[PDB]
Structures are given as structure tokens and as C-alpha cells.
């Protein structure tokens, strides 16, 4: 009866170490892309999760833990 349901994904950030990050939102779909400063190459990457139906583009959060992990997350409509 009192449920807040919440979308939720996590991404294992560790191994490609990303100098940043960038959490974009549009069009039912949560693109997460990262970027590792050549210390001789330019590494990328870019992952993309389909939203739930009905979700609010503007109340995807997302954070970093110490550990790593990147969480990101929306309340359920």
C-alpha cells in the first residue's frame, strides 16, 4: 500500500577508471558515458538502459560511491 517504487542500475566504474562522467536523460533512455585520458590512447564508453514506461526525465539521479560504483536511479510513476 505505502510502495515508492524506484528504477535502479548500477555500473562497475573501477576497472575503466573514467576521468569523467556524464549522466544524459532523454527520450526514455539513460545514456551513461565515460572518458579515460590517454596517460597514449583515448578510451570511451557508453552505455544505455531503457527507462520504465512513465518515468520523469527530470527525477533521474545519479551518484558515485568511494568504491566505484555508479548508481543511478528514478522514482516509479
Known sequence: ????????????VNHF?????TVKTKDGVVEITGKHA???????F????????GVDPTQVS????????LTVEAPMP
Request: charged share 30%.
Open 62 to 69: 545519479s551518484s558515485l560511491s568511494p568504491e566505484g560504483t
Open 46 to 53: 557508453t552505455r544505455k538502459y531503457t527507462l520504465p514506461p
Open 17 to 21: 577508471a573514467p576521468d569523467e562522467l
Open 38 to 44: 590517454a596517460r597514449y590512447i583515448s578510451r570511451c
Open 1 to 12: 500500500s505505502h510502495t515508492a517504487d524506484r528504477w535502479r542500475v548500477s555500473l562497475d
